[PDB]
Amino acid sequence: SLLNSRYKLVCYYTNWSWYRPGIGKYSPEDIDPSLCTHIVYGFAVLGNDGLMTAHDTWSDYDNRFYERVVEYKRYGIKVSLALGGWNDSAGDKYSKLVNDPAARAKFVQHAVAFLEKYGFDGLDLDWEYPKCWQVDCSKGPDSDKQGFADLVHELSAVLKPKGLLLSAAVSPNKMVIDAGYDVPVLARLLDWIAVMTYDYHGQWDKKTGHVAPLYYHPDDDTTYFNANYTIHYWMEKGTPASKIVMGMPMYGQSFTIENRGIHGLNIPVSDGGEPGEYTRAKGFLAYYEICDRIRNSGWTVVKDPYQRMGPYAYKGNQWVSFDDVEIIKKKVNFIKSLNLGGGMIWALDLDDYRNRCGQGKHPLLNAIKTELLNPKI
Ligand SMILES: O=C1c2cccc3cccc(c23)C(=O)N1CCCN1CCOCC1
Ligand SMILES: *[C@@H]1O[C@H](CO)[C@@H](O)[C@H](O)[C@H]1NC(C)=O
């Protein structure tokens, strides 16, 4: 069992996966309690009053999604509530909060009351990102860094006496890490740091790339857009290995290629890939959408024989990069070899939890669990 192990497996639950057709529909009761040590509920949002609030009252409150996920505490799983996320990070409201000591003080007391009201074990900060709002480092003030560190301290000061957890999902990007994070402060106060070692590449690059490279590849634009650099950089900035959980994507980044007879890495891309039937987001495909394309629609899969990155797959002018079971076992062995705190997955609802692709239920998450529980490295 993962609960008796030395590792965390932090699983992100998303409340919007309920709004998906057919087998893509995912509910709190679909969570497999044998596959996680920690569940993080995404997302609460920052209201206009500067207070944490439910993002989707119909699911979170009226259909009791908060309660139905907090239910998993009965298994010994720690259930935290995540604040923020990509969409909620678009504007300046998180920056206005952290730069205002009075606003932080009000926010912190209300947030802790919020957590205890619904029985959450902790809070997960997912501002994307301090200073570099949605990875645009020209947008936010440098004081976002000190303000975020002060917010983490003031939260920690209230949560820790109550035995509540405080964690943060953080950028894998070296420039964002430098600009937004007071790493020694965060490393000391957070119970764990979920490094989002994915989305290194996507349609915004205007060329094909892998969503989550593990190691440097000789054709890479940079030396630091890979999980190996990112994790070592967080530790170099002062993070203990035991506080790091390494994120792994349960999805792929998809691309519409120009289709000048080529389909490898770094080829020109005109747009995100066509949206999937279930996730309905251009540039994005769940793992269970990807394996159906490979198994039943004849997409061609290219693997890296050196296992520096997961596979990619293509058909026509459509191209998607993702993690399969093989690279995931390599990544978990990477986690164990560095004695990291454990792993994190985005997200529960994107793995093949229905066994639509015939490799068993939850093939990616079961591969992580199996490798984490294997003593050999
Ligand atoms: O990193 C970027 C990004 C970076 C730089 C420019 C962009 C322009 C448009 C869209 C994105 C970006 C973008 O969507 N992302 C992914 C963040 C959410 N990911 C988390 C898990 O699932 C969903 C994907
Ligand atoms: C991983 O990163 C470290 C430091 O950034 C580097 O020394 C090492 O060569 C990298 N490993 C691989 C396999 O690239």
From TrEMBL:
Residues 7-375 form the GH18 domain. Glycans are attached at residue 228. It comes from Ostrinia furnacalis. Belongs to the glycosyl hydrolase 18 family. Chitinase class II subfamily. Disulfide bonds join 11-36, 132-137, 291-357. The chain holds residues 1606 to 1992 of 2929 of the full protein. This is Group II chitinase.
